[PDB]
RNA sequence: GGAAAACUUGAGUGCAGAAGAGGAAAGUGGAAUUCCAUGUGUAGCGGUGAAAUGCGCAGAGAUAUGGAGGAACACCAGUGGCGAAGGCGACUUUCUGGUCUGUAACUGACGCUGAUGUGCGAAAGCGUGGGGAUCAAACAGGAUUAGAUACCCUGGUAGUCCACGCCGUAAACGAUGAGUGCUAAGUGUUAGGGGGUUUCCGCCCCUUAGUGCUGCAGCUAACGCAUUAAGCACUCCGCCUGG
């Protein structure tokens, strides 16, 4: 699942990679690719609006369907493939209808396995079906938050959510966060847990593997001048000298809650994060 | 272990004369069937340690009969190594 | 779980007091009031058998 | 509460009398501090 | 003989008045009968011919 | 339910009979065997008889008839009086008077008394 | 060479040819890979002693198989858990 | 709803608790020993069951559920003294059951008490 | 002792019967615990030698249905069974090890012990991941006391559980190495084997090998041991020689 590197070098020393044994085909599918230029933290005005983004490795975008629309048509799986743009793997499913498309590969998903995305579907790993027809208690992912828009929730590698109960036109669900939310009952969610479970366990072990990801280095606030950061310069190293740690733009950053209240989904959150 | 129709089959080739089971080379051959049967079981079941000293004991009862068989006739010992594959 | 009728309540108790004493309820939950060590119940059962 | 020391130092001997006195009170109190006995009436 | 696990009527005189097992101290059977009984009383608990408790 | 169960029927001890050398040959159908001069009443077959004894005696009282209970054996004298009062029927404890079913135009002369 | 005796239980709330359709898939499964069923005796409705999948009755089955492979009856164990009708099942070797 | 119900008592080693309900349990009324001014450790008495039983039974009053067929669900001192005191209310106790949770050696019980 | 032969008891294989929580892997099942969702319902619940911390009016506990998940397997269960020891307790299937009984067909001393070596080895630990229900070191808080860091109570992390590698230690104890003989008896019980009988199966009778309790001879410093020696012998190995 994971290979450890022998310490032949200081930069290779504690670094821990991931062997790609779930991957069965190392080549993308040429009709579902799309150019993905990097907007390295910069918006339409041209200026940097989120920090620490820059030039990683060049990437293609694979169009995968988070909405699962083709009802009652079976879909064999060709292959489990690599995707740079997300933490999970992707799965090239091929319909008996003839059309090819990707879905995010669940945990136990093999080649030659059929997948049904409709309301009259059996409750098996990879099948997509509305939350009304999903029985209470099972774990589920790729959750639509609005009917038809596509799955949004529990979609990174190893994420899942269990169906807790059913209100009138809502179902209860418990998130990977720990948060209990009401999601509208006519919304898809595919049965099972999404794979690539050992993604969180890579020690990238090197200042340059972080740069290949597109992650530019983060200079601390306490080693700045007092026009760059509110933790700007004392004489020598200084403690942060304020009642609270503060962000680069003068907001208290440790503990203070920033969810914008008086919101529509405030009726729908039942339990907070755990 | 092995079935009796498997066990009665293997005592036909190495038999020296009819109704002479219990001969040394006719009870080494049925051990080598039982050796090869149980460490194939033990190959897919690596945690079964109580069955391992059953193997390691009948390894010892095969070795004590091979060492016995050389002491009275060497030319019979050379034939059994060639008939069924053992080292040494 | 025995129904007792056609009598008073002070005689249905006399059935029920011995329909519980001949059952593994009171002697069972008094045993599991606290976890005993997995080799001291083998002697506790041995004392409850050698005396008979 | 009795105790005796046969020393000649009348300041160091009372360091042992108070030792024997403090031991005997704890014998008295733990004799009567076994009131805490879980006895449930019928 | 050998106790079959379907023969309920001879097998339920050995069950208790709640569903427990009578010991051979109070029933009076032999040793090897009691443990050939108990592997048949517990296959009959599994296929609902006899309860676990009543 | 319908019959006496097998456990309490032989716990009363109805499988015992009288002694061998004291035997009636017509009772061969209702004897399972003899163990030590003592015979053994077929317990499975008397259950097939006591239910037939239960069937008609159910429907005798359905017509409103009167069933006479008699008992005179000294170890079973007062076991039939207490069961006739619970039944509301007529018992006999002492000896048969000698005509209380046949010459009862002189016995009812004394039940009038 | 090996004598098996399965026993499987179906739902009470099924009708006639739904019942006899399910028993005839399994006796083909319990004939697969050289299994050659002795006979398939069927008990009737029994008031089963407790409450599985909040049901009160069950239709029982007894099929005796003479195999040497254990390929037919574990195939039966694979599919009877999948189907939501056949509620419990138990193979047992008789020696 | 009139004259049909299930009476539940579970006297533990403290605080005999009683909840009377209908035959398809929906919690008609309940009372305890703590609801009668017994603050602590007087609740583990049969005399606490002498008042706690009928003060839920007689203060039910919503349907006239006057039969009980009580259910016992606890090892306690006031176990049989809560059904003896239920005929002080006089509600025709007709089926007494000792339905207590007895494990099939399932979980680990807590530590011994020194 | 060497060599050439011969033998059958020792040892081993056959043949025919058994008994078993002996292991390993995969399935299945029920009661209970905890948590969540819901119905109904109202003031406490919980806990103790007494209380309090804690929980509850954002509906607690209690009750009823349904769900999820982890851990164990009540009754049977016994100075019982099995294994070399550690140990092993739901049920089913597959794979597999050992012992015992009986018959005498067969091999013909093939045996025993075993330094160095090589493998198993409770718990607590450690590593890489899982999983986390109860329980619970450390830790937090409330009481007790003369005093606390103890006992008691509420809560709680590692751990407890699984997979793979380690660690290799226990009052690992029958404080008793293994093997084979021989030496009063009495008595339970186990798988049998027979049995005589049968019993409605009941039993009660003689029989290898296990497993206990009594008790001579003999032994011991004394307790005690005594056909399961700590008795009488022979072989080999480990080990001790004041604290």
Swiss-Prot record, chain A:
GO terms for cellular component: large ribosomal subunit. Keywords: Ribonucleoprotein, Ribosomal protein, RNA-binding, rRNA-binding. Pfam families: Ribosomal_L2, Ribosomal_L2_C. The keyword Ribosomal protein applies. InterPro entries: NA-bd_OB-fold, Rib_uL2_dom2, Ribosomal_uL2, Ribosomal_uL2_bac/org-type, Ribosomal_uL2_C, Ribosomal_uL2_CS, Ribosomal_uL2_dom3, Ribosomal_uL2_RNA-bd_dom. Residues 35-54, 212-274 are annotated as: Disordered. SMART domains: Ribosomal_L2, Ribosomal_L2_C. GO terms for biological process: cytoplasmic translation. One of its GO terms (molecular function) is transferase activity. One of the primary rRNA binding proteins. Required for association of the 30S and 50S subunits to form the 70S ribosome, for tRNA binding and peptide bond formation. It has been suggested to have peptidyltransferase activity; this is somewhat controversial. Makes several contacts with the 16S rRNA in the 70S ribosome. Belongs to the universal ribosomal protein uL2 family. Part of the 50S ribosomal subunit. Forms a bridge to the 30S subunit in the 70S ribosome. This is Large ribosomal subunit protein uL2. The gene is rplB.
UniProtKB/Swiss-Prot annotation, chain D:
This is Ribosome hibernation promotion factor. Interacts with 100S ribosomes. Belongs to the HPF/YfiA ribosome-associated protein family. Long HPF subfamily. Transmembrane segments: none annotated. It is found in: Cytoplasm. The gene is hpf. Required for dimerization of active 70S ribosomes into 100S ribosomes in stationary phase; 100S ribosomes are translationally inactive and sometimes present during exponential growth.
From Swiss-Prot, chain G:
The keyword Electron transport does not apply. One of its GO terms (molecular function) is small ribosomal subunit rRNA binding. CDD domains: bS6 (cd00473). The keyword Repeat does not apply. GO terms for cellular component: cytoplasm; ribonucleoprotein complex; ribosome. Belongs to the bacterial ribosomal protein bS6 family. HAMAP family: Ribosomal_bS6. This is Small ribosomal subunit protein bS6.
From Swiss-Prot, chain H:
InterPro entries: Ribosomal_uS11, Ribosomal_uS11_bac-type, Ribosomal_uS11_CS, Ribosomal_uS11_sf. PROSITE patterns: RIBOSOMAL_S11. The keyword Protein biosynthesis does not apply. Disulfide bonds: none annotated. GO terms for molecular function: rRNA binding; structural constituent of ribosome. This is Small ribosomal subunit protein uS11. One of its GO terms (biological process) is translation. HAMAP family: Ribosomal_uS11. Coiled coil: none annotated. Located on the platform of the 30S subunit, it bridges several disparate RNA helices of the 16S rRNA. Forms part of the Shine-Dalgarno cleft in the 70S ribosome. Part of the 30S ribosomal subunit. Interacts with proteins S7 and S18. Binds to IF-3. One of its GO terms (cellular component) is ribonucleoprotein complex. Belongs to the universal ribosomal protein uS11 family. It comes from the Bacteria. Keywords: Ribonucleoprotein, Ribosomal protein, RNA-binding, rRNA-binding.
């Amino acid at each position: 699942a994971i290979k450890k590197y022998k310490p032949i070098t200081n930069g290779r020393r504690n670094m821990t990679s991931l062997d790609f044994a779930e991957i069965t085909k190392t080549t993308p599918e040429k009709s579902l690719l799309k150019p993905l230029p990097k907007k390295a933290g910069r918006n339409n005005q041209g200026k940097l609006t989120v920090r620490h983004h820059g030039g990683g490795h060049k990437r293609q975008y694979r169009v995968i369907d988070f909405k699962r629309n083709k009802d009652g048509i079976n879909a064999k799986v060709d292959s489990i493939q690599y995707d740079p743009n997300r933490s999970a793997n992707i799965a090239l499913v091929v319909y008996a209808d003839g059309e090819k498309r990707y879905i995010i590969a669940p945990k136990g998903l093999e080649v030659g396995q059929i997948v049904e995305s409709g309301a009259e579907a059996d409750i098996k790993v990879g099948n997509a079906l509305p939350l009304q027809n999903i029985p209470v208690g099972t774990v589920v992912h790729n959750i639509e938050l609005k009917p038809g828009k596509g799955g949004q929730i529990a979609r990174s590698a190893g994420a899942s959510a269990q169906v807790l109960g059913k209100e009138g036109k809502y179902v209860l669900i418990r998130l990977r966060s720990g948060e209990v939310r009401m999601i509208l009952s006519t919304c898809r969610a595919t049965i099972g847990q999404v794979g690539n479970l050992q993604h969180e366990l890579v020690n990238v072990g090197k200042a340059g593997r972080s740069r290949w990801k597109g992650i530019r280095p983060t200079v601390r606030g306490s080693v700045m001048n007092p026009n760059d950061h509110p933790h700007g310069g004392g004489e020598g190293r200084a403690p942060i000298g304020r009642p609270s740690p503060m962000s680069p733009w003068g907001k208290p950053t440790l503990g203070k809650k920033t969810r914008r209240g008086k919101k529509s989904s405030d009726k729908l959150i039942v339990r907070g994060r755990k | 272990a092995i079935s009796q129709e498997r066990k009665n089959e293997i005592i036909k080739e190495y038999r020296v004369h009819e109704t002479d089971t219990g001969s040394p080379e006719v009870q080494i051959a049925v051990l080598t069937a039982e050796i090869n049967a149980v460490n194939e079981h033990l190959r897919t079941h690596k945690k079964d340690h109580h069955s391992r000293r059953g193997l390691l004991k009948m390894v010892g009862r095969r070795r004590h009969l091979l060492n016995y068989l050389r002491s009275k006739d060497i030319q019979r010992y050379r034939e059994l190594i060639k008939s069924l594959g053992i080292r040494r | 779980t025995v129904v007792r009728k056609n009598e008073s309540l002070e005689d249905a108790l006399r059935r029920f007091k011995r329909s519980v004493s001949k059952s593994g309820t009171i002697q069972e939950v008094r045993k599991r009031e606290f976890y005993e060590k997995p080799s001291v119940k083998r002697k506790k059962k041995s004392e409850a058998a050698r005396k008979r | 509460l009795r105790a005796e020391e046969r020393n000649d130092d009348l300041y160091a001997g009372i360091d042992l009398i108070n030792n024997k006195l403090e031991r005997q009170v704890r014998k008295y109190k733990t004799r009567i501090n076994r009131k805490s006995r879980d006895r449930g009436d019928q | 003989t050998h106790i079959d696990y379907k023969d309920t009527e001879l097998l339920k005189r050995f069950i208790s008045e709640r569903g427990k097992i009578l010991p051979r101290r109070v029933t009076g059977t032999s040793a090897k009968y009691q443990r050939m009984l108990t592997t048949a009383i517990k296959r009959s608990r599994h296929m609902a011919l006899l309860p676990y408790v009543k | 339910m319908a019959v006496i169960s097998m456990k309490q029927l032989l716990e009363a001890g109805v499988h015992f009979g009288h002694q061998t050398r004291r035997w009636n040959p017509k009772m061969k159908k209702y004897i399972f065997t003899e163990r030590n001069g003592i015979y053994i009443i077929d317990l499975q077959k008397t259950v097939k008889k006591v239910d037939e004894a239960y069937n008609f005696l159910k429907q005798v009282s359905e017509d409103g008839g009167q069933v006479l209970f008699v008992g005179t054996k000294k170890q079973a004298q007062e076991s039939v009086k207490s069961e006739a009062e619970r039944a509301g029927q007529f018992y006999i404890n002492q000896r048969w008077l000698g005509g209380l079913l046949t010459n009862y135009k002189t016995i009812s002369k004394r039940i009038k008394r | 060479m090996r004598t098996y005796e399965v026993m499987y239980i179906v739902r009470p709330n099924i009708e006639e040819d739904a019942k006899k359709a399910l028993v005839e898939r399994f006796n083909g499964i319990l004939a697969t890979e050289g299994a050659e069923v002795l006979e398939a005796k069927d008990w009737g409705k029994r008031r089963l002693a407790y409450e599985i999948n909040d049901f009160k009755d069950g239709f029982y089955n007894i099929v005796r198989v003479k195999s040497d492979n254990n390929k037919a009856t574990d195939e039966f164990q694979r599919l009877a858990k999948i189907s939501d009708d056949i509620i419990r099942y138990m193979v047992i070797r008789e020696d | 709803n009139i004259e049909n119900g299930v009476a539940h008592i579970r006297s533990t080693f403290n605080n005999t608790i009683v909840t009377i309900t209908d035959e398809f349990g929906n919690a008609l009324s309940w009372s305890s020993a703590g609801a009668l001014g017994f603050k602590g450790s007087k609740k583990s008495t049969p005399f606490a069951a002498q008042m706690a039983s009928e003060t839920a039974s007689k203060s039910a009053m919503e349907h006239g559920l006057k039969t009980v067929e009580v259910t016992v669900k606890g090892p306690g001192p006031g176990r049989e003294s809560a059904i003896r005191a239920l005929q002080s209310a006089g509600l025709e106790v007709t089926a007494i059951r000792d339905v207590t949770p007895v494990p099939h050696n399932g979980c680990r019980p807590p530590k011994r008490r020194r």
